[PDB]
Amino acid sequence: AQGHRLYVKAKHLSFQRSKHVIHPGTSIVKIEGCDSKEEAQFYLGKRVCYVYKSSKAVRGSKIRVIWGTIARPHGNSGAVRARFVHNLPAKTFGSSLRVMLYPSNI
Amino acid sequence: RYVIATSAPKIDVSGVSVEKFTKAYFAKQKRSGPVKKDEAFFAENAPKNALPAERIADQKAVDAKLLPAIKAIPNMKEYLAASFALSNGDRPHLMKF
Amino acid sequence: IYKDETLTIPKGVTVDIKARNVTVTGPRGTLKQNLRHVDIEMKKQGNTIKFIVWHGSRKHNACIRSVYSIINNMIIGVTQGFRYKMRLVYAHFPININLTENGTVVEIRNFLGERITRVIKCLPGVTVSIDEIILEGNSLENVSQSAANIKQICNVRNKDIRKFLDGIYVSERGN
Amino acid sequence: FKRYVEVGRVVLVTKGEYTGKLAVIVDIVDHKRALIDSPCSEFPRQVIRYGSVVLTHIVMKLPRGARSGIVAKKWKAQDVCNKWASSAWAKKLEAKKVRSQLNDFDRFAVMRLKKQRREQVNVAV
Amino acid sequence: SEFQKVVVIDAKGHLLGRLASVVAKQLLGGQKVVVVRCEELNISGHFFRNKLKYLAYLRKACRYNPSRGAFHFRAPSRIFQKAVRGMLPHKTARGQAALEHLQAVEGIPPPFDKQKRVVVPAALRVLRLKPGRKYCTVGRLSSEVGWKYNDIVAKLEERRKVKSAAFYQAKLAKQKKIASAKEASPVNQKLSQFGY
Amino acid sequence: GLRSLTTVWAEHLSEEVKRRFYKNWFKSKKKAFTKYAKKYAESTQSINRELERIKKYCSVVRVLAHTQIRKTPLAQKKAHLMEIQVNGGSVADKVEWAREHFEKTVDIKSTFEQNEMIDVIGVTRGKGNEGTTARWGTKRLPRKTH
Amino acid sequence: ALKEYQVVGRKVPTEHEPVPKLFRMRLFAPNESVAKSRYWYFLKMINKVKKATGEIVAINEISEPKPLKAKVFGIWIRYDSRSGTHNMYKEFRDTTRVGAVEAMYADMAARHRARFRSIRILKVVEVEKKEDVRRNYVKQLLNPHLKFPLPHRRTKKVFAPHRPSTFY
RNA sequence: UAGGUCAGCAUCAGUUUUCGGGGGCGGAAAAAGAAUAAGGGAAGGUGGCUGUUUAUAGCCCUUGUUGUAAUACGUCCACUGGGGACUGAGGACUGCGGCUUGCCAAGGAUGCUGACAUAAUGGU
RNA sequence: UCUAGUGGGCCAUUUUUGGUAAGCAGAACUGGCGAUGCGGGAUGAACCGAACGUGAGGUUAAGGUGCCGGAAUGUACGCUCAUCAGACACCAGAAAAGGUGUUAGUUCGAACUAGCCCUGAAAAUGGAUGGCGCUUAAGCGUACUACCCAUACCUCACCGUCUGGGUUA
RNA sequence: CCAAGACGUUGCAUUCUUCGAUGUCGGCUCUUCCUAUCAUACCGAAUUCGGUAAGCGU
RNA sequence: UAUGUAUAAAAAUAGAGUCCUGUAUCGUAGAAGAUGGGCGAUGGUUGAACGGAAGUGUUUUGACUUGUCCAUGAAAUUCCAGAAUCCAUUGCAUACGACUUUAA
C-alpha cells in the first residue's frame, strides 16, 4: 500500500501575525523534514493543498480541496508562507496540508 | 514542470524519428459550442474506438525501437515498470533523483 | 586543569567501584557505599586508587581529599572495623542498660531517677555489648551515629550542667 | 576516560565548513580552543574550538607546535589514513556518505537486492 | 521534523518545564501526545525549594467556598498537565481542544507498555543541567504533598520491568538468529558498494 | 485507588435480599439472579474461574452480607445489604472463607468479644430546617431587635 | 569584531608651532571611525589637542604577525567603576592581540560589569618567558603534559528514539 | 473569426527577495604559510646521562630564493548563472533608443493550451 | 477685510522656588496630551517608535524570538544557588554596615578594593518577572550573526483635494 | 551600624475621586486574616532574657 | 483524520552492552496493482495457553508468491484539477420536591 503519496506532509501552524494582529491572507506552513530556510528554498513555489471532506457531493465527490502556493520561508526553523486561493479557515490550525512536488525544478 | 529528471542512465532514442510529434499531432478537436457530455459520449472515444491505427503503428514502432536499449541496460525494464512513491522518512529536498 | 590524589589499596579482597558505588569487601566484612554524590574519578589500577579532579574550583577540589578519607575509612572498616567504648557516669541513681536483639536495641532506665525508659535502635551493622558499653561494627559512620544517638538519648534537660554531670560519654574510639 | 584532549590526538571536525574532516591537535591554546592541522591540502592550519570537533580514539606521537610539514610526515609515518578507516565508526560514516549520494536508480536496485537478501530468512529448526 | 499519529514519551529524567513547553507546542500543532512515567520527572533546584513552591501553591484558595478556589492536584501526571495547561491557551477553544490530545499518566499502563517510547533531548536533565546542581523528582515531591499511590506504582513498575526484560531477551534471541543468517546471504557484499 | 475486579454471588438468595434490588417488588416478576442461579447450577467452572481470579489478582476481599430483617419487629421487608472487609490470612484464605460461608449466617458473638471498643456509624435523627441559633449555636440577639 | 589600528596625528600647523609633533597610538576599535574617535579621546585628555584643531595624519590596520602561534598576552587596563579607582593587570592565552583584547573585554564585563566606555587599555604586551607569567591558570595551561577530558559534550529533530549516550 | 468562468506553462515588463560563479583594484603591493638555502636561539629538554642544545623528535628568531605566491577581508564590474512571490495600470499612430527597410525586452501583457460551461467564480 | 471658537488646562525633559514631605503649590525652555489613532512598555491621556485616504507586495523603527506569541530551546566567554533567587528604561520602589558565600583584583600570611548572591528586610481575602515555568537559564554582563512586524519607509493600483501644463477641433 | 550604651549615623498637609446624596461614633452580633507572641509546645542564655512558632486560647 | 494510522530492554552519564542517536532498521517493483507460463525455494504475507495498572491485546494450532526469467494487457482521462414513575401507603424523612418504607 506504500506505492502512492507523491506529496509531502505539512501542518497549518497559524496566520502571519504580530502579538495582537493577524493577517489571514497568508498562512504559516510547517513542512515535515524542513528545518531551515536553506531547506525551505527547495519548497518555494510548490503547490500546497488543503484537502477536506464534506457531506454534499459537488461534482459527485465527497472531497473538496483548497489550493495554494508556497511563497517564501518564515523564520530560521524551515516554516514557509503560503497564499491560498481562498484563505484557509482559522479552524484548520494543526490540520495537515499536502505539498506536491510540482512545479518541479529538479 | 511536472517531471523529475532522474539520474538513471540515458536511453538511446537517436534511432527513432521524433519530428512527426507536433502540436497539431496531439491537438484535440474543435468544439466552438457549449453543448457537450453524454453517456454515449463517454462510451465513445476510449481506447477501443478512435485511436487511429496510424497512432497505433507509431506507438508500436517507437516501443519496439526502445526495447533494445532498455534490455541492454540491466534492471531498467523493471525500473520503468515500477512506480515512484515516497515512503516514511523520505525528504525530497535531500534525496537526489 | 587536573588535581590528583593517590591511595594504596590494602589487602582487601574486592575494591569494586562499579557505577560509582564502592562495594569494599574485606576479611572483616563487606561494606557498600554510594559515591555518586561527588563527580570524582576513582581509577583502579592494581593496588592503587587515583582520585582525579578536572577543571574544579576550590570547593570542588576540597571534596577530593574528603572522598579519599571516606574511602580510606571504608577500607579500614572492611579490614579491622571500628569499635567505640563509652563509659556511663552516674552520681546517685544507677543507670540500668538492657540489650535486646543481641545488642541491636539499647534500653536505658533510671537515668537521673527518671521513670521513662529510653529505647534506642542502633543502626544496621553495629553491635553493642556490656559501667562501659562497647559498640563494634564495620561502618565507622554508622557506629559513630549510633553512639551519638545514645548520647543524645541520655541527655539532661532544664538542669544546671555544672552540677548535674550525669550522662553517657564516649571514652575511646579505635579499631 | 578514553578521550583526553592532548597534543597529537586525532579529531574529527563536526561543525563548520570543514565538517567531516580529520585533523590532529597540534597545540592546546586553552580550555576552550586548540590549534589543529591536517596533512590534506584542503584543510589549513587553524585554531578551532572544542565544540566543533569530536575526539577520536587514535592518538599519534607529535611534538608540540609542529609545523604542517612535520605534521604531514608524522601522519604518513604513523599511517593515520586507513587507520581511522579500519574502525567501524569510519566505515559507518562512509556508508552514510555513499547512501546519501545514491540516486533514484541506485535506490531501486538496492530495493531489489535487499528484497533478494530478505528472501532467504532461512533459520535452523 | 516528523509527524506521528500518537507520540508516547518516556518522561523519566526529563525537566518539567522543558518537556511541558515541547509538549505544548506539539499539541498546538495538532499532534496527539501521551506522556508516561510522570513520577520520574525532574525539576531543577533542591527539593526543599520545590516543596516550598508547592506549599505556596496550596495557599491559593478562595476566601469564600474554597471549592471554587484553585484545585491543587497532587498526582505527578496532574502536575505535568498543569504546567502544560499554563502553556496552552486553555480558555480558548483552540487551546482547550489541544488539551484532550495530551494524556499524562503515572507509570506505563498496559496500552502503552507495548509501544515505543521516544525521549526529548531538549528536555533531558543530563543534557541541560550542569553536574553537581541539585534537583528533585516530581514523584517524591508528590508523595509529600498528598499523593498516596507512590509505592503501588513502584511495585507495578517493577513487575512491568521484569516482563519487558523477558520480552527483550526473546527479541534479542530472534534478532541474533536473523543476524547470523544475514551474513550467509551473498547479497550482503553485492549491497556493499551501495553503502548498505 | 481500589477497583472492584469482580463479584461472585451465592446460588440461592433469599426474598429479603432480593427485595433490595426492586423499588416495586409486588409488581415485579421477581426475576433477579434467576439466570445467575441457572448458570451456577449448570456450570460451576465459570464461578471457579471467578474465584481464582480474585485469589490471583485482588488484594482486598469483602463479603456481601444482608440482615435478616424479618426477624426484627420492623415493617420494612427489604434486607439491608453491605460489604464487610475480611482481614486476616492470605487472599486465598479470605476467598475460601467467603465461599464456604455463602448462604450461611455469621453471629455477632464470633466477631465482637463483649469488651471491644468499636465505632458506631449511622445517620443522625433529622431535625429538619433550623436557624443559626439552633443549627450553629449563635447567641440570641436582644429582645429589642427589629 | 575588533581590529588593531595604528593612528598617527598632530595638531594643525600654527605660527606658534610651525612644526607640530606627531603622536602615534596603537588602539583597538571595531572600525576606523571609532579608532579615530578614541585616538582623539586620549590625545584630548593628555596633550591639549582637539579634533577641531588637530588632524589624523596616518591610519593603518595592524595584522597579527604570527597568528598561528599560541602566545600569552598581559594587558594593563585602567578600569572605571562605581568608585572609578582601579588599575587591573590580566593575562590571557591567545593567538592574536585582537583576540586577547576581545577576550579581556568580555572577561571584564562578565566579572566586574565593565563596559567598553569604562575600560581603557593601558598596554598590551606579549609574555615570552614562562617564568614571567604570574597567573596560575596561564601557568597551568603552560604545563608541558597538559591533558583534560572534553567538557560539555551536549552530543533539530525533537523526539529522539534512544536515550543519548552523552559519553565517550 | 470573435466572445463566458476558473486554471496551467511560456516569453516579457515593473517591484522585491534568495542562492551561486568569473574578474579588476586596494592593504605591510594583506599578515601568515609551503618548499628550499643560511645565521642565531633557547626550551614547557627530544635522543643521549635530575642534568644538556638536534642527535635515534623538534620548536623559535632573523634573512634570501621559489614570489610578481595564495587565501581572507575591503571594494568595483555599463560581468554572469539560477529559484520564488506580488503586479499587467494604459489602449490606433507619434517619442527616446538598439538592430538591420523592417525587426526589437525601446513611452505599463501578451502568447499557446486545457477543464468547466458549471452555482464554477462572485454576492447575500 | 469680516468673523467664529478660546480666554478652567495637564504631562514629560532640563533649570528651579515655597515646603518635613506629597500623584503638593508656583515659575522658565522645548516637545507632547487636551484634539491622536497605530507598533512596543502585560495593562495606562501625555514613556519609547512612529503620526493615519482605500488596498497589494517588499523592508524596517521601538521592542523582541522556551510556551502562551509571529520570530534561533541561536553562537562565543563568564558570573550566580538564593528555606519562598533573578529577570529590561519611565515603573510601581529601599539604606548604612555586614558574610569562615563565591569569583576576581590591589598592596604589604594579612589588610583591603571590586562584581554576583545572602543578611540587614518588618502585615493583614489567595496571587502575581503578565502567566506557565526557567538553574552549563528561558537569570545577569558583553560581543556576534539569523529572524519576527506598525496605519512608518519603498514600488504599484484606485479615491479625493490642491497645484501646473494643454484643448475652436 | 561605629567605640567612650552616651557621642553620632542608616532604615522601617494636599483637594485627585464623590455635593441629580457612597447613611456619620460606640456597643451588640458574627466571621476571617496578619505577627510586631500574653499564655501553651520545643530548645537556648544568668524565679530573668532570647530563637523557631499564629496550632489553640486570650 | 487518515495515505507505511511499520517499530515495546532497563539503566548510568568521573560510563554502558560495539557506543560517538533513527539520514537507522522493518517493509517496499505488479490496470489503486491485470491475465498466463518456465525454473528455484518449502520460506513469506494473509481468510489452547498467556495478559487485571486502563487486562481492549499478545501467542499458538482457504486465496495470495516480486526468489528468478518470459509472454499478452493499459492509451483518446491524447499538458495541472422488565422494570421505573404517577395514583395509594409509610414517618426512621419532610416548606414543596426529595428521602425511607409497604403495596398484584
Side-chain angles (χ1 to χ4, degrees), chain A, chain B, chain C residues 10 12 19 26-27 29 46 56 62 77 81 91 94 103 113 124-125 137 147-148 167 174, chain D, chain E, chain F, chain G:
Chain A
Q2 42 177 349
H4 316 81
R5 210 271 293 278
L6 296 178
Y7 56 83
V8 184
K9 289 189 273 193
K11 295 215 155 304
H12 185 207
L13 290 187
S14 74
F15 294 138
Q16 196 246 11
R17 72 184 286 182
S18 57
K19 206 191 298 293
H20 300 296
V21 173
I22 55 163
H23 299 269
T26 79
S27 295
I28 295 154
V29 178
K30 173 83 222 84
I31 318 185
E32 160 188 328
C34 189
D35 277 21
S36 64
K37 44 186 175 77
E38 301 66 0
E39 294 163 8
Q41 266 299 345
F42 176 85
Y43 296 82
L44 295 200
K46 305 292 165 175
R47 202 88 182 277
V48 55
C49 87
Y50 166 55
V51 291
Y52 58 109
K53 71 174 90 173
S54 80
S55 62
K56 294 181 174 66
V58 56
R59 314 321 210 221
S61 160
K62 286 279 294 194
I63 303 289
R64 302 158 207 240
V65 177
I66 304 182
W67 289 108
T69 185
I70 296 169
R72 40 182 296 200
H74 187 77
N76 302 311
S77 289
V80 294
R81 305 194 196 176
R83 256 95 178 172
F84 293 80
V85 284
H86 308 305
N87 298 352
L88 272 203
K91 79 176 179 66
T92 65
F93 289 176
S95 282
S96 292
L97 315 159
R98 297 178 194 192
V99 182
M100 321 305 178
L101 293 188
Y102 58 85
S104 171
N105 181 245
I106 170 184
Chain B
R1 287 305 190 194
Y2 301 80
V3 287
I4 289 184
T6 62
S7 308
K10 260 71 178 180
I11 316 293
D12 289 330
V13 293
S14 64
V16 60
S17 66
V18 294
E19 70 279 12
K20 75 175 296 164
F21 310 137
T22 51
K23 315 271 292 189
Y25 176 69
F26 298 106
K28 270 172 197 173
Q29 69 106 27
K30 197 69 177 300
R31 309 191 185 168
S32 187
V35 292
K36 273 315 279 188
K37 185 261 297 177
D38 192 1
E39 191 275 331
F41 181 74
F42 294 139
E44 201 56 0
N45 313 335
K48 186 46 74 193
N49 315 116
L51 198 60
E54 186 272 358
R55 167 69 72 100
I56 272 296
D58 315 319
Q59 178 69 57
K60 199 165 303 181
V62 66
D63 203 339
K65 290 180 179 181
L66 270 67
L67 263 294
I70 72 181
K71 294 294 184 183
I73 165 63
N75 202 25
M76 190 65 107
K77 190 253 176 183
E78 302 90 337
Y79 178 68
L80 263 56
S83 301
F84 171 75
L86 295 169
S87 60
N88 287 11
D90 299 313
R91 301 152 77 180
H93 57 293
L94 265 300
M95 34 161 50
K96 52 178 303 301
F97 301 84
Chain D
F1 292 127
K2 52 183 76 174
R3 327 279 182 77
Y4 274 120
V5 182
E6 61 206 80
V7 181
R9 178 164 291 268
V10 178
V11 304
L12 179 64
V13 184
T14 55
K15 298 189 303 183
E17 192 274 330
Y18 301 112
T19 326
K21 293 285 180 298
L22 219 36
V24 57
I25 305 280
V26 181
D27 199 344
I28 302 184
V29 176
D30 55 50
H31 270 58
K32 303 301 227 294
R33 290 191 303 268
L35 180 132
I36 67 172
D37 208 322
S38 175
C40 300
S41 169
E42 64 268 19
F43 199 106
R45 192 179 187 187
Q46 62 193 260
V47 168
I48 210 167
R49 295 187 180 281
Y50 295 130
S52 158
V53 312
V54 290
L55 288 203
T56 69
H57 299 100
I58 296 188
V59 189
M60 51 98 69
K61 302 283 300 178
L62 191 73
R64 184 202 36 100
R67 298 304 203 88
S68 67
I70 296 305
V71 160
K73 72 183 298 203
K74 293 291 185 72
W75 188 291
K76 256 53 175 178
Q78 313 194 241
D79 88 4
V80 182
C81 303
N82 295 115
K83 187 185 179 155
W84 158 255
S86 324
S87 166
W89 180 10
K91 296 281 213 272
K92 170 180 170 296
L93 283 178
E94 321 315 329
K96 290 189 63 182
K97 177 53 184 181
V98 163
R99 208 171 317 183
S100 56
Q101 275 301 41
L102 295 175
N103 69 77
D104 193 18
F105 186 61
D106 296 351
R107 267 183 266 107
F108 175 78
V110 163
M111 181 255 268
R112 278 194 60 188
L113 273 162
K114 76 161 61 175
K115 181 175 278 192
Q116 276 164 22
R117 184 258 300 276
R118 74 162 293 274
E119 158 285 349
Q120 49 93 3
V121 284
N122 293 120
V123 293
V125 297
Chain E
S1 304
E2 61 76 10
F3 312 141
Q4 285 172 59
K5 277 66 163 179
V6 74
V7 166
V8 183
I9 289 149
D10 207 359
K12 186 200 164 54
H14 282 65
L15 296 165
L16 173 56
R18 301 298 179 102
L19 179 57
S21 165
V22 169
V23 162
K25 195 46 179 177
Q26 294 305 134
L27 295 166
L28 289 168
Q31 205 209 82
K32 190 178 304 293
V33 174
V34 183
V35 178
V36 296
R37 277 218 283 191
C38 280
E39 81 276 3
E40 303 274 0
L41 274 159
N42 278 340
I43 308 168
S44 49
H46 49 276
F47 176 72
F48 199 82
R49 184 167 180 270
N50 288 120
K51 174 75 161 304
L52 286 202
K53 283 195 196 159
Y54 204 95
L55 285 186
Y57 179 48
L58 291 180
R59 194 198 157 82
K60 314 303 191 292
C62 277
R63 199 54 254 172
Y64 69 101
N65 258 3
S67 45
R68 304 173 95 92
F71 310 120
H72 321 300
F73 293 84
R74 273 79 162 179
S77 63
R78 295 281 84 72
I79 284 164
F80 179 73
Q81 194 216 310
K82 170 190 178 287
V84 179
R85 190 269 307 277
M87 304 224 207
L88 296 173
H90 62 108
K91 303 271 196 68
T92 291
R94 177 182 93 115
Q96 215 274 350
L99 265 170
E100 291 76 320
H101 290 58
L102 170 75
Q103 188 177 12
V105 301
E106 297 123 2
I108 317 178
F112 307 117
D113 53 32
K114 289 176 165 185
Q115 293 183 13
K116 178 66 160 100
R117 299 167 284 270
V118 293
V119 303
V120 186
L124 282 164
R125 173 195 49 82
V126 56
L127 305 185
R128 293 310 311 185
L129 274 73
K130 185 184 291 295
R133 292 299 180 200
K134 311 191 193 77
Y135 65 103
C136 84
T137 76
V138 183
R140 178 202 181 182
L141 170 51
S142 286
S143 49
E144 315 181 40
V145 300
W147 192 44
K148 52 180 182 289
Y149 305 110
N150 191 6
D151 43 358
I152 296 96
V153 171
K155 183 166 79 68
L156 302 184
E157 206 68 27
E158 199 60 63
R159 178 187 286 110
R160 176 199 72 77
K161 277 164 199 303
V162 172
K163 299 163 72 174
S164 197
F167 152 76
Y168 176 63
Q169 313 294 320
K171 183 181 71 70
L172 271 193
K174 185 183 285 183
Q175 259 179 28
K176 184 60 101 178
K177 268 196 277 187
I178 271 284
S180 299
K182 189 75 67 71
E183 294 295 328
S185 61
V187 182
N188 58 0
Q189 60 86 30
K190 183 67 66 68
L191 280 167
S192 83
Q193 84 281 54
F194 288 110
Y196 285 78
Chain F
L2 257 57
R3 211 192 49 104
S4 52
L5 186 55
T6 185
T7 302
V8 181
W9 294 93
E11 172 179 1
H12 285 341
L13 295 202
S14 52
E15 171 178 2
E16 330 182 3
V17 70
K18 280 189 184 174
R19 289 169 142 272
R20 181 48 67 182
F21 296 89
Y22 298 89
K23 300 292 179 180
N24 309 336
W25 164 269
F26 68 103
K27 200 201 307 182
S28 57
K29 307 299 182 66
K30 301 102 176 179
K31 261 195 166 189
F33 286 101
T34 56
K35 205 164 303 294
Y36 203 100
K38 294 212 271 223
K39 72 175 282 295
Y40 202 105
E42 63 94 14
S43 67
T44 190
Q45 39 279 26
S46 61
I47 299 297
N48 263 347
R49 324 171 51 231
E50 289 292 330
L51 274 304
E52 292 298 327
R53 198 202 313 280
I54 302 176
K55 300 210 281 297
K56 184 172 181 178
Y57 308 93
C58 299
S59 72
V60 182
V61 164
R62 287 187 196 158
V63 286
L64 290 157
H66 86 95
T67 80
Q68 318 187 8
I69 195 149
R70 324 291 321 261
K71 294 207 163 47
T72 80
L74 294 179
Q76 169 156 352
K77 284 188 271 288
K78 286 155 82 86
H80 285 262
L81 178 77
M82 72 172 316
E83 295 187 7
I84 305 166
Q85 208 187 81
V86 178
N87 311 334
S90 176
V91 184
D93 295 332
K94 307 158 173 264
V95 155
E96 298 296 328
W97 195 86
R99 164 212 278 122
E100 75 184 317
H101 270 71
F102 282 165
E103 301 172 356
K104 285 96 174 177
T105 74
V106 52
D107 57 334
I108 193 149
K109 291 272 209 61
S110 66
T111 306
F112 303 135
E113 273 275 322
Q114 209 267 318
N115 280 320
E116 184 172 358
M117 301 285 248
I118 58 168
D119 311 333
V120 54
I121 317 168
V123 185
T124 66
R125 166 171 265 173
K127 310 302 183 184
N129 184 317
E130 287 294 337
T132 79
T133 296
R135 186 203 199 187
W136 283 105
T138 64
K139 177 148 298 307
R140 295 176 69 254
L141 298 179
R143 180 209 64 79
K144 297 183 66 173
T145 314
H146 178 223
Chain G
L2 290 195
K3 293 172 185 177
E4 196 170 17
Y5 287 111
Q6 159 205 22
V7 193
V8 192
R10 63 170 171 80
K11 60 183 70 179
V12 297
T14 51
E15 317 284 332
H16 316 128
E17 193 154 342
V19 193
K21 298 170 63 177
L22 275 35
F23 309 103
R24 165 187 173 276
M25 313 186 60
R26 289 161 55 98
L27 66 164
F28 307 85
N31 47 24
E32 296 195 344
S33 306
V34 176
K36 293 167 179 170
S37 174
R38 305 296 292 174
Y39 164 88
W40 284 126
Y41 168 65
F42 289 122
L43 272 197
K44 186 174 160 155
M45 151 185 58
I46 271 164
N47 294 87
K48 188 148 173 179
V49 52
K50 228 189 286 193
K51 179 256 166 183
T53 180
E55 61 179 18
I56 303 296
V57 73
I59 192 58
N60 275 324
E61 170 150 352
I62 319 178
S63 298
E64 182 70 24
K66 307 281 104 172
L68 291 206
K69 178 182 58 182
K71 292 158 291 196
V72 171
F73 290 107
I75 306 172
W76 291 266
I77 52 134
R78 180 178 153 160
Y79 166 58
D80 195 337
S81 197
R82 324 290 178 77
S83 179
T85 299
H86 293 105
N87 277 198
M88 301 262 179
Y89 163 63
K90 269 172 187 301
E91 295 182 355
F92 313 87
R93 184 160 165 80
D94 214 9
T95 60
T96 172
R97 303 174 54 91
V98 183
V101 161
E102 171 59 43
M104 171 275 288
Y105 270 122
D107 185 74
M108 281 275 318
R111 295 192 195 278
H112 309 109
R113 317 300 179 156
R115 276 74 176 170
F116 186 81
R117 38 184 184 80
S118 306
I119 311 153
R120 72 189 77 190
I121 299 161
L122 305 184
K123 180 175 207 333
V124 174
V125 78
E126 193 189 333
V127 182
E128 313 157 14
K129 273 70 64 179
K130 170 176 162 64
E131 57 89 17
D132 289 332
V133 169
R134 72 197 68 166
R135 293 285 164 265
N136 289 132
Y137 45 92
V138 177
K139 285 184 307 177
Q140 202 56 47
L141 313 181
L142 291 202
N143 190 1
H145 276 5
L146 185 32
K147 55 182 284 296
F148 46 87
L150 197 63
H152 212 331
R153 303 160 199 152
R154 216 188 180 157
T155 187
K156 301 188 179 268
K157 186 59 170 65
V158 74
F159 301 147
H162 298 291
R163 206 59 72 101
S165 286
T166 184
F167 206 46
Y168 299 164

